Amino acid sequence: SRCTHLENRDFVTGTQGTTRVTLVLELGGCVTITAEGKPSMDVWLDAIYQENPAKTREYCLHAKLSDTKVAARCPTMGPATLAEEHQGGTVCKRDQSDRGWGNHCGLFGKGSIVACVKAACEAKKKATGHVYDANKIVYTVKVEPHTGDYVAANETHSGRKTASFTISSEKTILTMGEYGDVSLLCRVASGVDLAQTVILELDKTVEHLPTAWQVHRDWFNDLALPWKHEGAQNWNNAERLVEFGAPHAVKMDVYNLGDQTGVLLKALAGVPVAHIEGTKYHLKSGHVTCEVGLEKLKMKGLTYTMCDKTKFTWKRAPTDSGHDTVVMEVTFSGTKPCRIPVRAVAHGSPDVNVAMLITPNPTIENNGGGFIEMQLPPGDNIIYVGELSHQWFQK
Numbered sequence: 001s002r003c004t005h006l007e008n009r010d011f012v013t014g015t016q017g018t019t020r021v022t023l024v025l026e027l028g029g030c031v032t033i034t035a036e037g038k039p040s041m042d043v044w045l046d047a048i049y050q051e052n053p054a055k056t057r058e059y060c061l062h063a064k065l066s067d068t069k070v071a072a073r074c075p076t077m078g079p080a081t082l083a084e085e086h087q088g089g090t091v092c093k094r095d096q097s098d099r100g101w102g103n104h105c106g107l108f109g110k111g112s113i114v115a116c117v118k119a120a121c122e123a124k125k126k127a128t129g130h131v132y133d134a135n136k137i138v139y140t141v142k143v144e145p146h147t148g149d150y151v152a153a154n155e156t157h158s159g160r161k162t163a164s165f166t167i168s169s170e171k172t173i174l175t176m177g178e179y180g181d182v183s184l185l186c187r188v189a190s191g192v193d194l195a196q197t198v199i200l201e202l203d204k205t206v207e208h209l210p211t212a213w214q215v216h217r218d219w220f221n222d223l224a225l226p227w228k229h230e231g232a233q234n235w236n237n238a239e240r241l242v243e244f245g246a247p248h249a250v251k252m253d254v255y256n257l258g259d260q261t262g263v264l265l266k267a268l269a270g271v272p273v274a275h276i277e278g279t280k281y282h283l284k285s286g287h288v289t290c291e292v293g294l295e296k297l298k299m300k301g302l303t304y305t306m307c308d309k310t311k312f313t314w315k316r317a318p319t320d321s322g323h324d325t326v327v328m329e330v331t332f333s334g335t336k337p338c339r340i341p342v343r344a345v346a347h348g349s350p351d352v353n354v355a356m357l358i359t360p361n362p363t364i365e366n367n368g369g370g371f372i373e374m375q376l377p378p379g380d381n382i383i384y385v386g387e388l389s390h391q392w393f394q395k
Protein backbone atom coordinates (compact mmCIF):
# COMPACT_ATOMS: atom_id res chain seq x y z
CA SER A 1 0.00 0.00 0.00
CA ARG A 2 1.40 3.41 -0.98
CA CYS A 3 0.60 5.12 2.32
CA THR A 4 2.88 2.66 4.16
CA HIS A 5 5.82 4.36 2.37
CA LEU A 6 5.58 7.58 4.40
CA GLU A 7 5.55 8.74 8.00
CA ASN A 8 2.72 11.21 7.46
CA ARG A 9 -0.36 8.97 7.17
CA ASP A 10 -3.97 9.39 8.28
CA PHE A 11 -6.71 6.79 8.58
CA VAL A 12 -10.28 7.71 7.63
CA THR A 13 -13.04 5.26 8.37
CA GLY A 14 -16.62 5.13 7.16
CA THR A 15 -19.13 3.08 9.20
CA GLN A 16 -22.64 1.77 8.32
CA GLY A 17 -24.36 3.93 5.68
CA THR A 18 -21.29 6.14 5.15
CA THR A 19 -21.18 6.37 1.36
CA ARG A 20 -19.32 9.69 1.06
CA VAL A 21 -16.10 10.80 2.79
CA THR A 22 -14.63 14.32 3.08
CA LEU A 23 -10.83 14.51 3.41
CA VAL A 24 -8.26 17.28 3.72
CA LEU A 25 -5.35 16.08 1.61
CA GLU A 26 -1.98 17.67 2.13
CA LEU A 27 1.17 17.58 0.01
CA GLY A 28 3.50 15.05 1.66
CA GLY A 29 0.62 13.29 3.42
CA CYS A 30 -1.35 10.15 2.56
CA VAL A 31 -4.80 8.91 3.59
CA THR A 32 -5.93 5.29 4.00
CA ILE A 33 -9.71 4.98 3.67
CA THR A 34 -11.41 1.85 5.05
CA ALA A 35 -15.18 1.18 5.03
CA GLU A 36 -17.45 -1.82 5.74
CA GLY A 37 -18.03 -3.86 2.61
CA LYS A 38 -15.75 -1.65 0.50
CA PRO A 39 -12.23 -2.33 -0.74
CA SER A 40 -9.76 -0.03 1.06
CA MET A 41 -8.25 2.93 -0.83
CA ASP A 42 -5.08 5.03 -0.46
CA VAL A 43 -5.54 8.64 -1.60
CA TRP A 44 -3.09 11.53 -1.64
CA LEU A 45 -2.50 15.01 -3.05
CA ASP A 46 0.49 14.48 -5.33
CA ALA A 47 1.26 17.94 -6.79
CA ILE A 48 0.14 21.58 -7.05
CA TYR A 49 1.50 23.56 -9.98
CA GLN A 50 0.87 25.88 -12.86
CA GLU A 51 2.53 25.68 -16.26
CA ASN A 52 4.19 28.89 -17.52
CA PRO A 53 2.98 31.24 -14.79
CA ALA A 54 3.18 34.99 -15.58
CA LYS A 55 6.53 36.60 -14.84
CA THR A 56 6.64 39.74 -12.81
CA ARG A 57 10.02 41.56 -12.57
CA GLU A 58 13.45 40.13 -13.27
CA TYR A 59 16.24 41.37 -11.00
CA CYS A 60 19.96 41.40 -11.81
CA LEU A 61 22.29 39.86 -9.18
CA HIS A 62 25.56 40.61 -10.94
CA ALA A 63 26.16 43.59 -13.22
CA LYS A 64 28.34 43.23 -16.30
CA LEU A 65 29.91 46.66 -16.91
CA SER A 66 31.71 47.73 -20.04
CA ASP A 67 32.88 50.61 -22.23
CA THR A 68 33.71 53.10 -19.47
CA LYS A 69 33.82 56.64 -20.90
CA VAL A 70 34.91 59.90 -19.27
CA ALA A 71 34.58 63.49 -20.50
CA ALA A 72 36.18 66.39 -18.59
CA ARG A 73 36.29 70.16 -19.23
CA CYS A 74 38.54 72.88 -17.88
CA PRO A 75 37.02 75.47 -15.44
CA THR A 76 35.92 77.97 -18.18
CA MET A 77 34.95 75.45 -20.87
CA GLY A 78 31.43 74.63 -19.64
CA PRO A 79 29.71 71.25 -18.88
CA ALA A 80 31.30 67.98 -19.90
CA THR A 81 28.89 65.73 -21.81
CA LEU A 82 28.73 62.21 -23.24
CA ALA A 83 26.17 60.81 -25.69
CA GLU A 84 25.77 57.93 -23.20
CA GLU A 85 24.17 60.23 -20.63
CA HIS A 86 21.04 60.08 -22.77
CA GLN A 87 21.07 56.42 -23.68
CA GLY A 88 19.22 53.79 -21.71
CA GLY A 89 21.39 50.95 -20.49
CA THR A 90 24.18 53.18 -19.13
CA VAL A 91 24.90 54.47 -15.62
CA CYS A 92 26.56 57.90 -15.35
CA LYS A 93 27.80 60.28 -12.68
CA ARG A 94 28.52 63.97 -13.16
CA ASP A 95 30.91 65.62 -10.70
CA GLN A 96 33.71 68.22 -10.53
CA SER A 97 37.44 67.65 -10.42
CA ASP A 98 40.30 69.97 -9.45
CA ARG A 99 42.02 71.32 -12.56
CA GLY A 100 44.94 73.69 -13.17
CA TRP A 101 48.13 74.06 -15.20
CA GLY A 102 49.24 70.59 -14.06
CA ASN A 103 46.49 68.98 -16.11
CA HIS A 104 46.41 71.52 -18.93
CA CYS A 105 43.81 74.12 -17.99
CA GLY A 106 44.39 77.88 -18.12
CA LEU A 107 42.81 78.44 -14.69
CA PHE A 108 43.14 76.57 -11.39
CA GLY A 109 39.64 75.62 -10.24
CA LYS A 110 36.76 73.15 -10.52
CA GLY A 111 36.16 71.56 -13.89
CA SER A 112 33.16 69.54 -15.01
CA ILE A 113 33.63 65.76 -15.36
CA VAL A 114 31.18 62.98 -16.30
CA ALA A 115 31.77 59.22 -16.47
CA CYS A 116 29.42 56.54 -17.88
CA VAL A 117 29.43 52.73 -18.15
CA LYS A 118 27.16 50.44 -20.10
CA ALA A 119 25.34 48.25 -17.58
CA ALA A 120 23.99 44.82 -18.42
CA CYS A 121 23.59 41.58 -16.48
CA GLU A 122 25.90 38.57 -16.37
CA ALA A 123 24.54 35.47 -18.10
CA LYS A 124 22.50 33.36 -15.68
CA LYS A 125 22.65 35.93 -12.89
CA LYS A 126 18.97 36.93 -12.80
CA ALA A 127 16.40 36.38 -10.05
CA THR A 128 12.94 36.13 -11.67
CA GLY A 129 9.56 36.20 -9.93
CA HIS A 130 6.42 34.34 -11.09
CA VAL A 131 2.79 34.68 -9.97
CA TYR A 132 0.01 32.12 -9.99
CA ASP A 133 -3.42 32.46 -11.53
CA ALA A 134 -5.95 30.57 -9.33
CA ASN A 135 -7.82 29.73 -12.50
CA LYS A 136 -4.88 27.96 -14.09
CA ILE A 137 -3.37 26.17 -11.10
CA VAL A 138 -3.66 22.34 -11.19
CA TYR A 139 -4.03 19.96 -8.22
CA THR A 140 -3.16 16.31 -8.91
CA VAL A 141 -4.66 13.56 -6.73
CA LYS A 142 -3.69 9.87 -6.82
CA VAL A 143 -5.80 6.88 -5.80
CA GLU A 144 -4.60 3.30 -5.29
CA PRO A 145 -6.74 0.32 -4.29
CA HIS A 146 -5.59 -2.16 -1.58
CA THR A 147 -5.04 -5.26 -3.69
CA GLY A 148 -3.13 -7.42 -1.21
CA ASP A 149 0.05 -6.79 -3.24
CA TYR A 150 2.98 -4.99 -1.70
CA VAL A 151 4.85 -2.60 -3.98
CA ALA A 152 7.98 -0.68 -2.96
CA ALA A 153 8.34 3.09 -3.44
CA ASN A 154 10.57 2.75 -6.53
CA GLU A 155 8.01 0.41 -8.11
CA THR A 156 4.72 1.20 -9.87
CA HIS A 157 1.38 -0.18 -8.65
CA SER A 158 -0.63 -1.20 -11.74
CA GLY A 159 -3.90 -0.16 -10.09
CA ARG A 160 -2.93 3.45 -9.30
CA LYS A 161 -5.07 6.18 -10.97
CA THR A 162 -4.48 9.93 -11.35
CA ALA A 163 -7.03 12.78 -11.28
CA SER A 164 -6.33 16.44 -12.12
CA PHE A 165 -8.39 19.34 -10.86
CA THR A 166 -8.70 23.04 -11.82
CA ILE A 167 -11.27 25.51 -10.48
CA SER A 168 -13.42 25.01 -13.59
CA SER A 169 -13.28 21.18 -13.39
CA GLU A 170 -13.80 19.99 -9.82
CA LYS A 171 -15.23 16.51 -10.27
CA THR A 172 -13.71 13.34 -11.75
CA ILE A 173 -15.05 9.74 -11.87
CA LEU A 174 -12.21 7.15 -11.86
CA THR A 175 -12.57 3.50 -12.80
CA MET A 176 -10.53 1.50 -10.24
CA GLY A 177 -10.07 -1.61 -12.42
CA GLU A 178 -12.47 -4.31 -11.25
CA TYR A 179 -13.23 -2.52 -7.97
CA GLY A 180 -15.75 -0.19 -9.57
CA ASP A 181 -15.91 3.57 -9.96
CA VAL A 182 -14.90 6.17 -7.37
CA SER A 183 -15.92 9.85 -7.61
CA LEU A 184 -13.62 12.68 -6.55
CA LEU A 185 -14.78 16.23 -5.97
CA CYS A 186 -11.84 18.42 -4.99
CA ARG A 187 -12.29 22.17 -4.66
CA VAL A 188 -9.23 24.19 -5.68
CA ALA A 189 -10.91 27.23 -4.00
CA SER A 190 -10.44 25.39 -0.68
CA GLY A 191 -6.72 25.25 -1.41
CA VAL A 192 -3.80 27.54 -0.65
CA ASP A 193 -4.41 31.30 -1.10
CA LEU A 194 -1.75 32.54 -3.53
CA ALA A 195 -2.35 36.29 -3.64
CA GLN A 196 0.86 37.22 -1.79
CA THR A 197 3.03 34.40 -3.25
CA VAL A 198 5.85 34.80 -5.76
CA ILE A 199 7.89 31.82 -6.97
CA LEU A 200 11.51 33.06 -7.14
CA GLU A 201 13.81 31.42 -9.68
CA LEU A 202 17.56 31.98 -9.97
CA ASP A 203 19.49 29.68 -12.29
CA LYS A 204 17.67 26.31 -12.10
CA THR A 205 20.63 24.55 -13.76
CA VAL A 206 22.88 25.09 -10.68
CA GLU A 207 23.29 21.69 -9.06
CA HIS A 208 23.77 22.47 -5.37
CA LEU A 209 20.71 24.63 -4.84
CA PRO A 210 16.91 24.20 -4.76
CA THR A 211 15.40 25.17 -8.16
CA ALA A 212 13.03 27.80 -6.66
CA TRP A 213 11.71 29.45 -3.52
CA GLN A 214 8.26 30.50 -2.42
CA VAL A 215 8.58 34.10 -1.21
CA HIS A 216 6.30 36.93 -0.09
CA ARG A 217 5.28 39.44 -2.79
CA ASP A 218 6.10 42.52 -0.68
CA TRP A 219 9.61 41.25 0.11
CA PHE A 220 10.22 40.45 -3.58
CA ASN A 221 8.99 43.87 -4.72
CA ASP A 222 11.39 45.60 -2.33
CA LEU A 223 14.65 43.97 -3.43
CA ALA A 224 17.31 46.64 -3.86
CA LEU A 225 18.60 45.35 -7.17
CA PRO A 226 18.47 46.51 -10.79
CA TRP A 227 15.21 45.26 -12.39
CA LYS A 228 13.33 45.08 -15.69
CA HIS A 229 10.42 43.34 -17.37
CA GLU A 230 11.18 40.14 -19.25
CA GLY A 231 11.65 41.23 -22.85
CA ALA A 232 12.82 44.75 -21.94
CA GLN A 233 16.34 45.48 -23.18
CA ASN A 234 17.67 47.66 -20.36
CA TRP A 235 17.75 47.60 -16.56
CA ASN A 236 16.10 50.14 -14.28
CA ASN A 237 18.10 51.33 -11.29
CA ALA A 238 21.33 49.74 -12.56
CA GLU A 239 23.17 52.19 -10.31
CA ARG A 240 22.26 49.94 -7.38
CA LEU A 241 25.26 47.71 -8.25
CA VAL A 242 27.66 50.47 -9.35
CA GLU A 243 29.76 52.94 -7.37
CA PHE A 244 31.84 55.85 -8.65
CA GLY A 245 35.14 56.92 -7.11
CA ALA A 246 36.05 60.52 -6.27
CA PRO A 247 37.33 62.14 -9.48
CA HIS A 248 40.96 63.21 -9.88
CA ALA A 249 41.84 65.46 -12.83
CA VAL A 250 40.42 63.82 -15.98
CA LYS A 251 39.59 60.41 -14.48
CA MET A 252 36.87 58.84 -12.36
CA ASP A 253 36.85 55.13 -11.35
CA VAL A 254 33.81 52.87 -11.69
CA TYR A 255 33.34 50.07 -9.14
CA ASN A 256 31.16 46.97 -9.44
CA LEU A 257 29.56 45.79 -6.20
CA GLY A 258 29.98 42.13 -7.25
CA ASP A 259 27.73 39.09 -7.35
CA GLN A 260 24.79 39.47 -4.95
CA THR A 261 23.80 35.78 -5.07
CA GLY A 262 25.48 35.01 -1.75
CA VAL A 263 23.68 37.95 -0.17
CA LEU A 264 20.31 36.80 -1.54
CA LEU A 265 20.87 33.19 -0.44
CA LYS A 266 21.40 34.33 3.19
CA ALA A 267 18.08 36.14 3.01
CA LEU A 268 16.47 32.97 1.56
CA ALA A 269 17.53 30.63 4.37
CA GLY A 270 14.41 29.61 6.25
CA VAL A 271 12.18 30.56 3.31
CA PRO A 272 10.23 27.56 1.94
CA VAL A 273 11.52 25.94 -1.26
CA ALA A 274 9.42 25.35 -4.38
CA HIS A 275 10.32 23.32 -7.47
CA ILE A 276 10.42 23.83 -11.25
CA GLU A 277 10.11 20.89 -13.68
CA GLY A 278 10.43 22.26 -17.22
CA THR A 279 7.48 24.62 -17.60
CA LYS A 280 5.73 23.44 -14.41
CA TYR A 281 6.11 25.60 -11.31
CA HIS A 282 5.28 23.48 -8.24
CA LEU A 283 4.43 24.36 -4.67
CA LYS A 284 6.06 21.93 -2.19
CA SER A 285 3.53 22.60 0.51
CA GLY A 286 -0.24 22.92 0.27
CA HIS A 287 -3.62 21.22 0.81
CA VAL A 288 -7.09 20.73 -0.69
CA THR A 289 -10.36 19.21 0.56
CA CYS A 290 -12.00 16.46 -1.51
CA GLU A 291 -15.22 14.47 -1.24
CA VAL A 292 -14.76 10.80 -2.12
CA GLY A 293 -17.81 8.84 -3.29
CA LEU A 294 -17.57 5.15 -2.41
CA GLU A 295 -21.03 3.84 -3.37
CA LYS A 296 -19.89 2.30 -6.69
CA LEU A 297 -16.94 0.37 -5.20
CA LYS A 298 -17.21 -3.43 -4.88
CA MET A 299 -14.93 -5.96 -3.11
CA LYS A 300 -13.06 -8.67 -4.98
CA GLY A 301 -13.16 -12.43 -4.37
CA LEU A 302 -16.13 -12.74 -2.00
CA THR A 303 -17.38 -15.97 -3.59
CA TYR A 304 -14.06 -17.85 -3.63
CA THR A 305 -13.68 -20.82 -1.29
CA MET A 306 -11.39 -20.54 1.72
CA CYS A 307 -7.76 -21.31 1.00
CA ASP A 308 -6.43 -24.66 2.20
CA LYS A 309 -5.44 -23.88 5.84
CA THR A 310 -2.40 -26.16 5.44
CA LYS A 311 -0.55 -24.41 2.61
CA PHE A 312 0.60 -21.01 3.95
CA THR A 313 4.17 -19.96 4.78
CA TRP A 314 5.59 -16.55 5.80
CA LYS A 315 7.35 -14.61 3.01
CA ARG A 316 7.71 -11.60 5.34
CA ALA A 317 7.07 -12.28 9.01
CA PRO A 318 4.80 -9.83 10.90
CA THR A 319 6.53 -6.50 11.39
CA ASP A 320 5.74 -3.14 12.92
CA SER A 321 4.64 -0.66 10.22
CA GLY A 322 5.34 2.47 12.21
CA HIS A 323 1.63 3.42 12.05
CA ASP A 324 0.57 1.15 14.92
CA THR A 325 -0.40 -1.59 12.48
CA VAL A 326 1.26 -4.89 11.61
CA VAL A 327 2.27 -5.76 8.04
CA MET A 328 3.16 -9.22 6.74
CA GLU A 329 3.17 -11.27 3.58
CA VAL A 330 2.33 -14.93 3.09
CA THR A 331 2.93 -17.42 0.26
CA PHE A 332 0.27 -20.03 -0.63
CA SER A 333 1.06 -23.33 -2.35
CA GLY A 334 -2.47 -24.60 -2.89
CA THR A 335 -5.02 -23.98 -5.64
CA LYS A 336 -5.95 -20.40 -6.48
CA PRO A 337 -7.91 -18.21 -6.24
CA CYS A 338 -9.15 -18.37 -2.63
CA ARG A 339 -9.90 -16.33 0.49
CA ILE A 340 -7.14 -16.16 3.11
CA PRO A 341 -8.30 -17.39 6.56
CA VAL A 342 -6.65 -14.69 8.74
CA ARG A 343 -7.37 -14.02 12.41
CA ALA A 344 -5.53 -13.28 15.62
CA VAL A 345 -6.20 -14.06 19.27
CA ALA A 346 -4.94 -12.59 22.51
CA HIS A 347 -2.60 -14.94 24.40
CA GLY A 348 -4.93 -16.93 26.71
CA SER A 349 -8.23 -16.37 24.84
CA PRO A 350 -8.15 -18.61 21.75
CA ASP A 351 -11.86 -18.03 21.04
CA VAL A 352 -12.05 -14.26 20.41
CA ASN A 353 -10.72 -12.93 17.07
CA VAL A 354 -9.02 -9.60 17.88
CA ALA A 355 -7.70 -8.74 14.39
CA MET A 356 -8.98 -5.54 12.70
CA LEU A 357 -8.05 -5.88 9.02
CA ILE A 358 -7.01 -2.84 6.99
CA THR A 359 -6.58 -5.00 3.86
CA PRO A 360 -10.14 -5.89 2.65
CA ASN A 361 -11.11 -9.54 2.07
CA PRO A 362 -7.52 -10.89 1.76
CA THR A 363 -7.30 -13.30 -1.15
CA ILE A 364 -4.65 -15.21 -3.02
CA GLU A 365 -5.34 -14.51 -6.71
CA ASN A 366 -3.79 -16.43 -9.60
CA ASN A 367 -0.99 -13.83 -9.78
CA GLY A 368 -1.23 -11.73 -6.63
CA GLY A 369 -2.43 -11.34 -3.07
CA GLY A 370 -0.67 -12.27 0.14
CA PHE A 371 0.14 -8.89 1.69
CA ILE A 372 -1.94 -8.11 4.78
CA GLU A 373 -2.01 -5.11 7.07
CA MET A 374 -3.94 -5.31 10.34
CA GLN A 375 -4.25 -3.67 13.74
CA LEU A 376 -4.04 -5.66 16.98
CA PRO A 377 -4.70 -4.72 20.62
CA PRO A 378 -1.69 -4.07 22.92
CA GLY A 379 -0.08 -7.12 24.50
CA ASP A 380 0.79 -10.68 23.45
CA ASN A 381 -1.18 -12.07 20.52
CA ILE A 382 -0.84 -14.95 18.07
CA ILE A 383 -1.55 -14.34 14.40
CA TYR A 384 -3.05 -17.19 12.39
CA VAL A 385 -3.22 -17.55 8.63
CA GLY A 386 -4.96 -20.92 8.60
CA GLU A 387 -2.67 -23.22 10.59
CA LEU A 388 0.33 -20.97 10.03
CA SER A 389 0.94 -19.03 13.25
CA HIS A 390 3.14 -16.26 14.59
CA GLN A 391 3.67 -14.75 18.03
CA TRP A 392 3.20 -10.99 18.13
CA PHE A 393 3.76 -8.56 20.97
CA GLN A 394 1.84 -5.34 20.21
CA LYS A 395 3.32 -1.98 21.30
Ligand SMILES: *[C@@H]1O[C@H](CO)[C@@H](O)[C@H](O)[C@H]1NC(C)=O
Binds near residue numbers: 155
Ligand atom coordinates in the same frame (compact mmCIF):
# COMPACT_ATOMS: atom_id res chain seq x y z
C1 LIG B 1 14.14 -0.78 -6.74
O1 LIG B 1 15.27 -0.61 -5.84
C2 LIG B 1 15.91 -1.87 -5.48
C3 LIG B 1 16.98 -1.58 -4.41
O2 LIG B 1 17.84 -0.50 -4.76
C4 LIG B 1 16.44 -2.58 -6.75
O3 LIG B 1 17.08 -3.81 -6.42
C5 LIG B 1 15.25 -2.83 -7.68
O4 LIG B 1 15.68 -3.49 -8.86
C6 LIG B 1 14.59 -1.50 -8.03
N1 LIG B 1 13.45 -1.75 -8.90
C7 LIG B 1 13.06 -0.83 -9.77
C8 LIG B 1 11.86 -1.19 -10.63
O5 LIG B 1 13.61 0.26 -9.89
